[PDB]
Design a protein around this ligand. Structure first.
Ligand SMILES: CCCCCCCC/C=C\CCCCCCCC(=O)O[C@H](COC(=O)CCCCCCC/C=C/CCCCCCCC)COP(=O)(O)OCCN
Lengths: 71, 83
């Protein structure tokens, strides 16, 4: 006298299944991104200004060596 | 005062690339004429000795011309090293 055994859902019910779109925001603000970009640009401009002025002085020294040697 | 603001808002909403390019070009046009360093660059370009400095014949009444490179007369580049 065996009872009916059959593939059925468990008692009560199966756990809820997610189906809605899940796309998080995941970012900074536009103002912050622009501000970081301009800050990086200004730091680069200042560094390049110093280095190019030093390069100009070094080139002047190199040219003076040639002027001394030319005669 | 009020038309230009609405136009700028609309342009920033629809064509930010054009607003950015026009702003950058305008700054590039305007700022050099308001800078104190623009003269300095010219002076630097004038201090670079590409060719030989040919000596002058001392006629006896040339006070400001040096007789030796290390003499105090003549142009100075002290402003450049401190820059
Ligand atoms: C003072 C210096 C000036 C020169 C420097 C700039 C260098 C080069 C930049 C310009 C290069 C050529 C620009 C070509 C212009 C394009 C004109 C055009 O066709 O515009 C329309 C669109 O209309 C526009 O022109 C866009 C807005 C108007 C111009 C952009 C803004 C103008 C100036 C804004 C910045 C001003 C300064 C910033 C102020 C900051 C706020 C205080 C194109 O869109 P469609 O192809 O038709 O789209 C179809 C698909 N939907």
């Amino acid at each position: 006298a065996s009872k009916v055994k059959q593939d059925m859902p468990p008692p009560g019910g199966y756990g809820p299944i997610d189906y809605k779109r899940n796309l998080p925001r995941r970012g900074l603000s536009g103002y912050s991104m622009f501000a970081v970009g301009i800050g990086t640009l200004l730091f680069g401009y200042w560094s390049m200004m110093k280095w190019n002025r030093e390069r100009r002085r070094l080139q002047i020294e190199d040219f003076e060596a040639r002027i001394a040697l030319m005669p | 005062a009020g038309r230009i603001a609405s136009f700028l808002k609309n342009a920033w909403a629809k064509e930010p690339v054009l607003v950015a390019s026009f702003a950058i070009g305008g700054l590039a046009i305007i700022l050099p004429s308001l800078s104190p360093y623009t003269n300095y660059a010219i002076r630097i370009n004038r201090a670079t000795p590409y060719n030989y400095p040919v000596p002058l014949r001392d006629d006896g009444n040339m006070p400001d011309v040096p007789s030796h490179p290390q003499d105090p007369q003549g142009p100075s580049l002290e402003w450049l090293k401190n820059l």
